[PDB]
Amino acid sequence: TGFNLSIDTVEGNPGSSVVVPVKLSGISKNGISTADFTVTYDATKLEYISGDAGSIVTNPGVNFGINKESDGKLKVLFLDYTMSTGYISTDGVFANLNFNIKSSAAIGSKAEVSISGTPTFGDSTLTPVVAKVTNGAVNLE
Amino acid sequence: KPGDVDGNGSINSIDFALMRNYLLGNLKDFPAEDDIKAGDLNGDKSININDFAIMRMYLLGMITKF
Numbered sequence: 001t002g003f004n005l006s007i008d009t010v011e012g013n014p015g016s017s018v019v020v021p022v023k024l025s026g027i028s029k030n031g032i033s034t035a036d037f038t039v040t041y042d043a044t045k046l047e048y049i050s051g052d053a054g055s056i057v058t059n060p061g062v063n064f065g066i067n068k069e070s071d072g073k074l075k076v077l078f079l080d081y082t083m084s085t086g087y088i089s090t091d092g093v094f095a096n097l098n099f100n101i102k103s104s105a106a107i108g109s110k111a112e113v114s115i116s117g118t119p120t121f122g123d124s125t126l127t128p129v130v131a132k133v134t135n136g137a138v139n140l141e
Numbered sequence: 142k143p144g145d146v147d148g149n150g151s152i153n154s155i156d157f158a159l160m161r162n163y164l165l166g167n168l169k170d171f172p173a174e175d176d177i178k179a180g181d182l183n184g185d186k187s188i189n190i191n192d193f194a195i196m197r198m199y200l201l202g203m204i205t206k207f
């Protein structure tokens with residue numbers, strides 16, 4: 001099964017909040033022990049509020065972080081700090097990105113949310129796992 | 142070079158993992174030619190939890206360099 005890093009395409013309303021899930025699929029029996037990647041978003045339409053570990057993440061209070069580096073640019077990091085049996089084993093949501101949709105944003109327009117540059121994932125052997133990337137968006141309705 | 146403990150050309154979460162294994166006492170030697178140049182990010186010529194903390198800040202974009 002192929003390994004995929006994807007960002008959902010979600011609907012939301014100008015003036016409202018929205019969650020944009022970032023997902024992994026095709027995690028092997030070797031799991032995921034490390035991750036780093038950048039997420040860009042259309043800051044002319046979206047205001048970043050926070051980012052939370054998704055349900056597949058082990059011990060997120062220790063292992064996971066997300067930081068807004070600048071407007072439109074997030075950095076995401078995961079490590080199994082145990083380096084032993086804390087790898088991610090289950091496909092699903094890896095991060096939930098929480099935005100407020102700007103009230104000025106036009107109905108029917110799209111706010112792109114994308115992976116930027118090179119993402120890195122390491123399995124439980126610390127071997128790189130190359131992800132197929134699919135980008136997403138907030139579809140304003 | 143500084144931060145690139147596996148020598149692959151980029152500083153990433155696999156370097157962070159290798160640093161964790163070194164701290165945990167599970168890895169004795171980095172693939173880098175010079176473990177200190179690669180692994181010491183605060184300038185005491187040793188590798189410890191503080192260098193790891195610094196790499197985390199870098200990978201999170203909280204700093205732009207060491």
Ligand SMILES: [Ca+2]
Nearest residue numbers: 145149151156
């Ligand atoms: Ca490296």
Ligand SMILES: [Ca+2]
Nearest residue numbers: 171172173174
């Ligand atoms: Ca070495």
Ligand SMILES: [Ca+2]
Nearest residue numbers: 181183187192
């Ligand atoms: Ca040091």
